[PDB]
Design a protein around this ligand. Structure first.
Ligand SMILES: CCCC[C@@H](CN[C@@H](CCCC)C(=O)N[C@@H](CCC(N)=O)C(=O)N[C@@H](CCCNC(N)=[NH2+])C(N)=O)NC(=O)[C@@H](NC(=O)[C@@H](NC(C)=O)[C@@H](C)O)[C@@H](C)CC
Length: 203
């Protein structure tokens, strides 16, 4: 399908013979599902996100059907806030990010989808993250008025400053919207701005 980003790109998956809902997440390296039993041997791993690290169980070579497309690969199981399908399995199902219906650049997911953005007169690198509702930029002395906000992910919550109506050029495409500024480990372009540049998921 072609999936636009006005809503969270939630899809049904089948894993271990059971149905679950999960988020297609281009900002995730790996696939992480809520605590469940999986037929297999596993090993302990730690993974990180916007607010810190959690402990997970790594299962390798697990069959997963993702909106009807087959994958067999690594599934991490643990206390994730949201079930997420990450790049390890998105690449298996042929998923790419596309600008303006496929008239624009296609970005494959073999490596993290990092692009150049311009904000506040400054050029920065940021991750195109379909699993992010909002856009979160590293500490930056943005002018203007703002309101406090807390945003959550793996690890919990960080406190950020919410700025509205900030222009943000992404790979040469003009956008303008809400930008959250705080101690993120990676600059993240989320759905609020991805939609403005006509970004879709396709597989
Ligand atoms: C779990 C909640 C949904 C998925 C998540 C994916 N974001 C990426 C951002 C990149 C890191 C800051 C992420 O955590 N990716 C992880 C997923 C875990 C994984 N293993 O794949 C990742 O790739 N982690 C790498 C490490 C990332 C950084 N590495 C590095 N800088 N070298 C990993 N291998 O551990 N989305 C979010 O974290 C966003 N949260 C949300 O969109 C919503 N919040 C919640 C709680 O649902 C909304 C209601 O606020 C944040 C940005 C705020 C808008």
């Amino acid at each position: 399908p072609q999936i636009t980003l006005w809503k969270r790109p939630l899809v049904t998956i089948r894993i271990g013979g059971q149905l679950k809902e999960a988020l297609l997440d281009t900002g995730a390296d790996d696939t992480v599902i809520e605590e469940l039993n999986l037929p297999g041997c596993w090993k302990p791993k730690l993974i990180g996100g916007i607010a810190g690290f959690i402990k997970v169980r790594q299962y390798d070579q697990i069959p997963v059907e993702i909106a009807g497309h087959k994958a067999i690969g690594t599934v991490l199981v643990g206390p994730t806030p949201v079930n997420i399908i990450g790049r390890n399995l998105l690449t298996q199902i042929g998923a790419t990010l596309n600008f303006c219906g496929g008239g624009g650049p296609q970005i494959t997911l073999w490596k993290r989808p990092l692009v150049t953005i311009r904000i506040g007169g400054q050029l920065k690198e940021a991750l195109l993250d379909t699993g992010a509702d909002d856009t979160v930029i590293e500490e930056l002395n943005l002018p203007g008025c703002w309101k406090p906000k807390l945003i959550g992910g793996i690890x919990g919550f960080i406190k950020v400053r919410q700025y509205d109506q900030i222009p943000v050029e992404i790979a040469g495409h003009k956008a303008i919207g809400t930008v959250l500024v705080g101690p993120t480990p990676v600059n993240i372009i989320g759905r609020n701005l991805l939609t403005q540049i006509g970004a879709t998921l396709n597989f």
